[PDB]
Paper text:
BG18 exhibits the highest potency among the V3/N332gp120 bNAbs described to date. To better understand the molecular mechanism underlying BG18’s interactions with Env glycans and increased potency compared with other V3/N332gp120 bNAbs, we determined the crystal structures of natively glycosylated clade A (BG505) and clade B (B41) Envs in complex with BG18 Fab. We found that BG18 binds the V3/N332gp120 glycan site in a distinct manner relative to PGT121-like bNAbs, primarily through rearrangements in its VH and VL domains. Analysis of BG18 interactions bound to a natively glycosylated Env showed engagement with oligomannose glycans near the base of the V3-loop and the conserved GDIR peptide motif.
Residue numbers in the entry:
A (entry chain H): 191 to 243
B (entry chain G): 31 to 140, 152 to 185, 187 to 309, 312 to 321, 321A, 322 to 398, 411 to 505
C (entry chain B), D (entry chain C), E (entry chain A): 518 to 547, 569 to 664
The structure:
Amino acid sequence: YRLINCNTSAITQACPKVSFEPIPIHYCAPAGFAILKCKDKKFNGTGPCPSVS
Amino acid sequence: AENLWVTVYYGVPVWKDAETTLFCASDAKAYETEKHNVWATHACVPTDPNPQEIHLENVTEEFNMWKNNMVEQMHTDIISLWDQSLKPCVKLTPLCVTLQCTNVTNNITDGELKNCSFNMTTELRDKKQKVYSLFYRLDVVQINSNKEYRLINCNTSAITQACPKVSFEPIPIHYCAPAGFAILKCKDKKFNGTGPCPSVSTVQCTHGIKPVVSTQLLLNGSLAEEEVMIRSENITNNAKNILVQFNTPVQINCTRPNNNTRKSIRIGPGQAFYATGDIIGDIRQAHCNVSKATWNETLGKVVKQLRKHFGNNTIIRFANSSGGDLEVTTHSFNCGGEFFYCNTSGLFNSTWISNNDSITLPCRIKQIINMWQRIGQAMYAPPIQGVIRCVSNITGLILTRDGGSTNSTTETFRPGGGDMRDNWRSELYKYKVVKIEPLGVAPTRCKRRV
Amino acid sequence: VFLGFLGAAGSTMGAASMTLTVQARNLLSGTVWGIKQLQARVLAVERYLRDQQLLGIWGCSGKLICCTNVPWNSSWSNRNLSEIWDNMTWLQWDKEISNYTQIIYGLLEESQNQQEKNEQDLLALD
Amino acid sequence: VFLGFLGAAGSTMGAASMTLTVQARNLLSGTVWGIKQLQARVLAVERYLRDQQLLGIWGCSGKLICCTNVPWNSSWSNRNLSEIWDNMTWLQWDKEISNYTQIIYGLLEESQNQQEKNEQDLLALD
Amino acid sequence: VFLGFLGAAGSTMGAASMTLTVQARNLLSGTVWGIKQLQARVLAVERYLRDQQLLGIWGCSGKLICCTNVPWNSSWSNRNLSEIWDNMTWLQWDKEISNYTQIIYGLLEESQNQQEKNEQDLLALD
């Protein structure tokens, strides 16, 4: 046999040091922008929200 | 009353001369040649679709086509543009092996090319590849029986292959100042390159030029106005390379009339090579055709402005370049992804005193090149499927002269130049930078309260 | 008369203190290669901020017109007022300050508002 | 009462324009990946200083709430002071000004403070 | 006797309120092996524009000195006046407000210009 990328591509092994568990991140905004959050619970996505947050 | 003071006004029409960094613009229709960034457009602001130009009066400034530092930055911008448009692609290090070269597969009637064989590494590592290609006599040199060649740059440096999509024909771009800076234009007709310019306008954004890598001639650019331009850095210094700006456009139409074939060569893992496949059919050599009518008048028009630059009664001669490298002896320019080199002997060849069809020039097809004197980088231009053609308004010229000679009797004029900085002077004679200083000051007679 | 941005670059200073606001518009005008604009709009505020700080300390605070209390001590480019505001433009007179414009402002921020903003709480303690 | 930030969006214009000193406190305060936050804050002060100039190249000079001498032209949703100012919300009032707010400031620096603070000059030089 | 920058370090508050145009003038002052400059300067106007921000929202705007219309809430360490200005420094002063300036500063902005500038739109209209 051969390795499978060989008939198409190059390939690179990562460092076994680097771990890969999902870790949380907050997305940010500066002076002039923000992010909205419609606090509806029964929220089917489309429309104005009664108690927008 | 009369004892003067200090009175402050902000937003005054006052600026200073200083040099700094502009930012790109490039229209929005020129945005559409792409090819994974032809040149540099990424987050670049598209040109204000109508770049407002504000005419000025009672405004004077000294422009210069020599100490100008917009030539300085531009000469190293295009170097790294070229560098970065190259540096993530395929290396061709296994291609520095001796190539068996022999007179190309024809029925003689010489050929200029050769049918050349070699080994090469494929997708698997341990197995090699028998395959042959076709190179020009400038792409290879005889390192030392059938004549044995190497890639001519192996003796020098390491090379690269371009990602084939990149379209190399020059593309129009504009130039904008951010706020706090402005751009001034020298809209005059008889500008001797040194002293006060006669007509200034300002913009946030300029016109559209094309990065034309052309030694000797200039094309794809900006024509002159009225009587043909005879400009010099200082009209008594022959060691400075001399520049010209035509009024009449001479129409060119370079072509590589060979329906080219491109070979898919697996030399990875992943890496590939695009080899020069077999030329489809009849064999013709690349060339550039030029109209006879407009050339005959670029003679008489330019000539009579030279007796205005030395003697109303003398004899003027033109001859071709005696020797150097092909960039200066021939016409160096990219035509469709590869570089042409046309023998410029038929032009620089005339004699001048005090008082239907076409023509062409023979051009050599060059693919590998080590341009920009970026000592360390030469590379291979991928083959160009299909017949190539490229047209342009011929626009400029670089040339030189002789020495003392027999004075007033005659004088020679020859081609050369080469250094891509004097080519950037063919458009930068009319552009310089300013910074805005809105806080003026004046002595009226007034004062502020306590 | 309204002849555009920098339209009055070389006419009489009286006709040149008109458009004090159009030149106060394009002092702020709002991987790689994005570096070409990010280092350009950085130097837009740099041509504005220099004057925002200077005028703020002074009796200007705001922009446009701003009287000051500095005697044009006749050792400077002493001229007739007509030889300043009537026969010259911005360019022809900011030429004249240049011999002494490095001397005028050991005063506006250094001898005026250093002292004329500390008698505002020896007086204002009533 | 110090509720928070911008609760008065579907609330009346005065209750909105009440806390004029709340929203202006937390906006400045005091490799790759370290570049997306970098390209966000230098384009977050060029626009801020574009405002710092405009409050100075008009007559206001100071900060906060300045009034104007401009025809609020009748075509712009005219209700009474009490049916606009003492009645409506910036959810229900900004829903009516939008389509023509570009004509109001085709003037806010043009025929006024450009020529107005120059009227201060042709005056105070003779 | 011109003692330099912050040369009134360990001197009386009154004398150390003189050079207000010395520690505020030069707070703006008008590849690799280059990241260093372009990195460090992104901090200069972050700790300067904060000051051009906060003076505007207080009863200040006009630079240097400017008073307030707020009660000095006597829960703070109030002291005798001939034991403050006559003798204290700007280096001994700020050490005291340390333990509670996060409770202290919620007033000039929350109280004065939230109401003392809303006594001006309880002035100018009808």
